[PDB]
Scaffold this motif. Structure first.
Motif: not given
Lengths: 90, 96, 99, 96
Positions: B79-96
């Motif tokens: 089996g394999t495990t997918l890693s996603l290390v965040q390098k940048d983020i932009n908030l389009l619409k926040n949560g209520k």
């Protein structure tokens, strides 16, 4: 407009097995570090013919693929949408 | 030379869970639900945040259900495990 | 495989002006302000399903997330100068908050 | 609000230094049938300025992500210059 696009540069570390087409890409960013293996699925026939007729094993390619992750355990799908042959595998 | 980056747009479908590594390096973990087509599959991605300025931005300003644009370096560990290390983020619409 | 893609988040600071190409297309502007400086981008919409979605449901001042293919072509001004006109053909949009 | 751009193309100029930042041009041609789009890239980040001068040569196929800004200037009449501040670069194939 949700999406999940994947951009991969690496060497094709498997042969093209027909079922659509399926192959693996070996991506090693650091010479000393780990080598990431991604399973690519090809549905577009123009790109299937380009792989079997022009691309050889071990070729350095740049692939853009739509990523899908099914959870049940996760199953990662990588459907190739475009490819550029940087250097072929002789 | 080689790289494997992924760009994701979707809603944060989980809370920001704080963790610590054996090297005492703090990092954040959350999930993103991305559904491109109405008649299609809903994709869930697990995001790991190492950059400290982005960890603080997520816990203090971003809420669950927020529409975000995340760019992360993808790694597939065996089996394999997918890693996603965040390098940048932009908030389009926040949560209520 | 070469491309130049553009992602914009901002408020539509103009109306949807319809034109024709010889197919039809609409044009509008997006006012993006990060931090400050305000950037003005001119968007072009050729996809007919998105043309209808913009004129019928989207109003001025709406916060939108637009992805557009960026193109650049050079024109020659009469006074010898050399300018660049940026083209942004909208490929997809998500309405965050209307006006 | 934000406006980012992802470009893949070949560097069609040398690295001209100014003050401190670096400047180069990218020729992006999606089709041999079609046009060649030219973009001017501005590099402020020090680790990326050194990576360009030490490793990258003219003609290199690169994948550049940059924060886009649209500066208007009066001249006569008005004009527009597109600013692209490089935030990350991935070298697909170097030049010769």
């Amino acid at each position: 407009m949700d999406f999940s696009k994947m951009s991969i540069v690496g060497r094709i570390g498997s042969e093209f097995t027909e079922h659509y087409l399926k192959y693996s890409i070996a991506s090693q960013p650091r010479r000393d570090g780990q080598t990431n293996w991604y399973n690519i699925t090809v549905f577009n026939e123009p790109q299937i013919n380009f792989l079997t007729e022009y691309v050889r094993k071990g070729a350095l390619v740049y692939v853009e693929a739509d990523a899908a992750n099914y959870v049940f355990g996760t199953t990662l799908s990588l459907v190739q949408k475009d490819i550029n042959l940087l250097k072929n595998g002789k």
